[PDB]
Amino acid sequence: KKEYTGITYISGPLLFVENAKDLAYGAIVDIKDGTGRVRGGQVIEVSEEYAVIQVFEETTGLDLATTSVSLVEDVARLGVSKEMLGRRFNGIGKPIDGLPPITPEKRLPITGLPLNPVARRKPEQFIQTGISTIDVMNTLVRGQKLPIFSGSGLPANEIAAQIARQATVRPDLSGEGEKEEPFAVVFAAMGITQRELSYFIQEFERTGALSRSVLFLNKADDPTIERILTPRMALTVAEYLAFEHDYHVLVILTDMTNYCEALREIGAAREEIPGRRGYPGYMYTDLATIYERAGVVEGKKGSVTQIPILSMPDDDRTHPIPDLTGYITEGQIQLSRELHRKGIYPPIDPLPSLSRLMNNGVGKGKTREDHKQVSDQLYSAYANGVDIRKLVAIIGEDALTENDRRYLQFADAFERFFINQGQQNRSIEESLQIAWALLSMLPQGELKRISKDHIGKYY
Amino acid sequence: MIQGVIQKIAGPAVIAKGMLGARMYDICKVGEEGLVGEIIRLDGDTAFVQVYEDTSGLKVGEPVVSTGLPLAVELGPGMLNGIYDGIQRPLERIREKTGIYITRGVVVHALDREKKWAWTPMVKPGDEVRGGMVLGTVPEFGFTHKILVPPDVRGRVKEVKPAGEYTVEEPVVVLEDGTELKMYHTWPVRRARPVQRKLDPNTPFLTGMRILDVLFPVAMGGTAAIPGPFGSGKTVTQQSLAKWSNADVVVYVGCGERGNEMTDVLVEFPELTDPKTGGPLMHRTVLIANTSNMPVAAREASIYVGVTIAEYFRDQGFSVALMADSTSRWAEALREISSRLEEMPAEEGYPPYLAARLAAFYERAGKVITLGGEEGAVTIVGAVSPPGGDMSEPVTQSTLRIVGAFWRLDASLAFRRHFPAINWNGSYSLFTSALDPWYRENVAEDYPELRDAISELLQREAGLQEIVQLVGPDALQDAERLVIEVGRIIREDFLQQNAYHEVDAYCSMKKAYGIMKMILAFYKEAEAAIKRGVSIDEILQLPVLERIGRARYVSEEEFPAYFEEAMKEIQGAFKAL
Numbered sequence A: 001k002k003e004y005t006g007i008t009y010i011s012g013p014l015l016f017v018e019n020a021k022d023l024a025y026g027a028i029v030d031i032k033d034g035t036g037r038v039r040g041g042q043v044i045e046v047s048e049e050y051a052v053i054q055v056f057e058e059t060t061g062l063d064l065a066t067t068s069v070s071l072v073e074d075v076a077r078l079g080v081s082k083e084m085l086g087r088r089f090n091g092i093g094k095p096i097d098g099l100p101p102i103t104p105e106k107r108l109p110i111t112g113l114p115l116n117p118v119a120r121r122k123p124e125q126f127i128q129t130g131i132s133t134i135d136v137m138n139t140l141v142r143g144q145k146l147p148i149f150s151g152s153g154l155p156a157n158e159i160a161a162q163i164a165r166q167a168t169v170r171p172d173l174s175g176e177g178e179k180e181e182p183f184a185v186v187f188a189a190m191g192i193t194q195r196e197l198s199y200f201i202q203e204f205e206r207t208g209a210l211s212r213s214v215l216f217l218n219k220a221d222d223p224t225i226e227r228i229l230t231p232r233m234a235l236t237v238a239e240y241l242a243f244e245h246d247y248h249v250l251v252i253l254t255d256m257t258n259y260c261e262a263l264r265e266i267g268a269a270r271e272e273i274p275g276r277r278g279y280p281g282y283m284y285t286d287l288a289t290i291y292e293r294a295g296v297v298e299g300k301k302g303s304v305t306q307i308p309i310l311s312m313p314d315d316d317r318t319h320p321i322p323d324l325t326g327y328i329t330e331g332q333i334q335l336s337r338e339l340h341r342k343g344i345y346p347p348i349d350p351l352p353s354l355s356r357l358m359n360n361g362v363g364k365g366k367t368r369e370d371h372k373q374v375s376d377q378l379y380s381a382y383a384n385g386v387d388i389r390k391l392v393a394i395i396g397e398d399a400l401t402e403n404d405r406r407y408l409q410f411a412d413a414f415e416r417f418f419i420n421q422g423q424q425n426r427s428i429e430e431s432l433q434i435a436w437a438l439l440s441m442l443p444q445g446e447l448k449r450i451s452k453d454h455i456g457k458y459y
Numbered sequence B: 001m002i003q004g005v006i007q008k009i010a011g012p013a014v015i016a017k018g019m020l021g022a023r024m025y026d027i028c029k030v031g032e033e034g035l036v037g038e039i040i041r042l043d044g045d046t047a048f049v050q051v052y053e054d055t056s057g058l059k060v061g062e063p064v065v066s067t068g069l070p071l072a073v074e075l076g077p078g079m080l081n082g083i084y085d086g087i088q089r090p091l092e093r094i095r096e097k098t099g100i101y102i103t104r105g106v107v108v109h110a111l112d113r114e115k116k117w118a119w120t121p122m123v124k125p126g127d128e129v130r131g132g133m134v135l136g137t138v139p140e141f142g143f144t145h146k147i148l149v150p151p152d153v154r155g156r157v158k159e160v161k162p163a164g165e166y167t168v169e170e171p172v173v174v175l176e177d178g179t180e181l182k183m184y185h186t187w188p189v190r191r192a193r194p195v196q197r198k199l200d201p202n203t204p205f206l207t208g209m210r211i212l213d214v215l216f217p218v219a220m221g222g223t224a225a226i227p228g229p230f231g232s233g234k235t236v237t238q239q240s241l242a243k244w245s246n247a248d249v250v251v252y253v254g255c256g257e258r259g260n261e262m263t264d265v266l267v268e269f270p271e272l273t274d275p276k277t278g279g280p281l282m283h284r285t286v287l288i289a290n291t292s293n294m295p296v297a298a299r300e301a302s303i304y305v306g307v308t309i310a311e312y313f314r315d316q317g318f319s320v321a322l323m324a325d326s327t328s329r330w331a332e333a334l335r336e337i338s339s340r341l342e343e344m345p346a347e348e349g350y351p352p353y354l355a356a357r358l359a360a361f362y363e364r365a366g367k368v369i370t371l372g373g374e375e376g377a378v379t380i381v382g383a384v385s386p387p388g389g390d391m392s393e394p395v396t397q398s399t400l401r402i403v404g405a406f407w408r409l410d411a412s413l414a415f416r417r418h419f420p421a422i423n424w425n426g427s428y429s430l431f432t433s434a435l436d437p438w439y440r441e442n443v444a445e446d447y448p449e450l451r452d453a454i455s456e457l458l459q460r461e462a463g464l465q466e467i468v469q470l471v472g473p474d475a476l477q478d479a480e481r482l483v484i485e486v487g488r489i490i491r492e493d494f495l496q497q498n499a500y501h502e503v504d505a506y507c508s509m510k511k512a513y514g515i516m517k518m519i520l521a522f523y524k525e526a527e528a529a530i531k532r533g534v535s536i537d538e539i540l541q542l543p544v545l546e547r548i549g550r551a552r553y554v555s556e557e558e559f560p561a562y563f564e565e566a567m568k569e570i571q572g573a574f575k576a577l
């Protein structure tokens, strides 16, 4: 308030603070200086001697001499409001649009708690994306988490923001009134450059859909501390959507590489001994909790989708940061150079990629019947052809039988047109058709995974 | 002001006592000599002195007196054609007072105090102004060297001395505010002077290395990174920019790079001509060099001054190209403090700050309109050095995924003999789509298509490479060995320039562009050669291949027609055979 002053020992980003008692672990406070500017610092480690507060920013200028610290509030957090729904905000939760703040309806503890198991209701629903391939072969089901493993320089972001706007759940195909349920895309990146920061806002505003989405985006340079809380924000805000009003959310976090890069620093200073290959011991846990914001919960009808997209450095699937995820998130959708070099877009491979849970997706009495078998068609068909494309280099083409010679050509039409999709949006129904057509190229009575009926109605 | 003495001196760091009221990061003077200090930690009333130069020969109980300003280079007209120590001290004058030794106990001035200058004013007195509003234009070489309001000053004028020679120190503007503007103005380093606002970029930063201009390239606001082990050309690819970039100011600064590579640019650089005037090219040049050999802490100072210089010029209106030569040593330098002050570190012992002071740096600028309403660009292409070769190592990696435009410089490439060969199967730029407008119009209207087909072979070629090492080039037949060889030539001739061949070491687009169209053709017609019934085998051994060979060497003047001659030679030299 007025009060607690005579701060001794400040080295770099750490700070000890004289006798407080009031404080609590997980408190947050205003530091005030000799020039009126104010700074913030979280309450970590406290005793009967001192507490520990942590300069968020720079600390340029401070003094042994008095320059007090103001207790802000218990366990800080933020409220919410339906108002929020077309804004531009930074980290903590302040207006970056330039239009006055929110006005609550609630305050929300920002430790997100954990669910219960019984409460959760098994997924069974479907979601379109508007991208093709990631709906046809391996289909984002509803109330589902799933992540896009990118490479170092393959273009994640774009393949992000398309799948930002594009999606719209069609309940239509299942049967029920249309506007019984609306769609909320909740989006948060971080470690974004002045450059990146602009590619979003341009696309977002373009046709606009800001008016059905919430922003959160913690600049690159911005203090490393707030970074840590940043996602948890847009996660918890997501709750307030579906559980108190029903909605259908799509949360898309991004670049969780940053999430740990940034993480480490905190832990490295606040003390601990880092475990295996760095990445502070309690990662498993800490990472876990930023993914239990998902699934439908009986009775309640709305729910959360996670797609967090991140990049590896070692360009593997063995470095921990992604590997780890791959135990709790449930699938994998990679991007290869191969596609991308040849110039396609958005390059999402086939075969590396597969959503483990997707059976309770698409169905005969849920959203189109034949989809099942399309999915296991084009997959297994595909891989058969990608060998030939290499072995043709050793024996010429004068030694391919007829049936199989066609399985070469399949690949070309698949790769050139099918996984390319520029800016064209599509839909689950238009997409299944295309597929079919291409399959017609190879000889019939052979695609023996698929059942005869369907072929008798489509070709 | 605030003063105490040495308590504990041992290593580049010291702990004084009897001190309070200090502020974080503050210049000071320690020892009878006076040396330049920094406040980096406090503990009751004792403070860790960080001591910028050397040490040795000290006793406990010697002066320790702060002034309480926290670092800053004093910026104003006349700075080019010089060299500058880590706290911007002109070594010329130093050399003139020492001999041939960088000696402690030195104080001079940043901008020389003698020279007076031809003034011109703009605004009339009795007028209003706000922050960073232009005031006077003192001319300076081929440049026009404006002067601004120092940011965050606003008020109303009251007199203006008219034209004539005038001192640097002089107050040549008075205000009704009791304030005084003089030529220069001091500005911190830890801060980051604003601008009017942030904006997207789209103008290519030309560079003339075909490899940096047809494949990977850079936006004007560009940020990139160049790494490669020892002996890899790391330095020399920044040499070229320093003498063939396309902008107002090269501000080459390297920290921890040897003399030899610096001094050289101080004896060659006088006798050359810029692509933007005709004058001694050295006008667009900074050099704040601070070679490895010097002190410890200076290595930390060094960079952030040349970042600031990078703002300072932008500010006036120009087009900054800053490049730090070998920023990685900086990490090592930072971490040498650490060790002595006992901060537990994160992996590979770097103190956890790698991100902290990295990430602020690289984000800095590009195409940002100023307070003056000019188009300001900050172009940085950061050099780094790993210490292994394992790009897995933290300080390296942290660069990626903080900046775009990554170039990697392969190691095993270079041992053979090319330069500035890079792996393009490592590399990747991001900036490459928002360059399309400018390219279309400026260069050719069909260029990006014609380039993607080059990458069409080039990145696909590995497709075969692997199979070569699995069963030889043997039993790879003919659409096979077509490609292999095409591409063979593609890197043998479209990817290797020099920095020492007398000519041919700089190109315009339109020239380069040319080379590149040929090869496509050659591919095309070859494709139709084998399909028709003959074979590459002899085609390789055609004389016309070698013409495509040597090709790059002729200069521009000839270039049109050179290129036209092969444009005839193709269609005849296929159909015939």
Ligand SMILES: Nc1ncnc2c1ncn2[C@@H]1O[C@H](COP(=O)(O)OP(=O)(O)O)[C@@H](O)[C@H]1O
Binding pocket: B228, B229, B230, B231, B232, B233, B234, B235, B236, B237, B418, B419, B420, B497, B498, B499, B500, B501
């Ligand atoms: N463009 C070039 N033309 C000719 N030789 C080059 C070229 N680039 C590099 N080299 C040769 O290879 C060396 C590699 O550069 P070097 O100065 O060792 O770089 P660094 O040590 O900073 O990696 C050069 O010194 C030069 O001998």
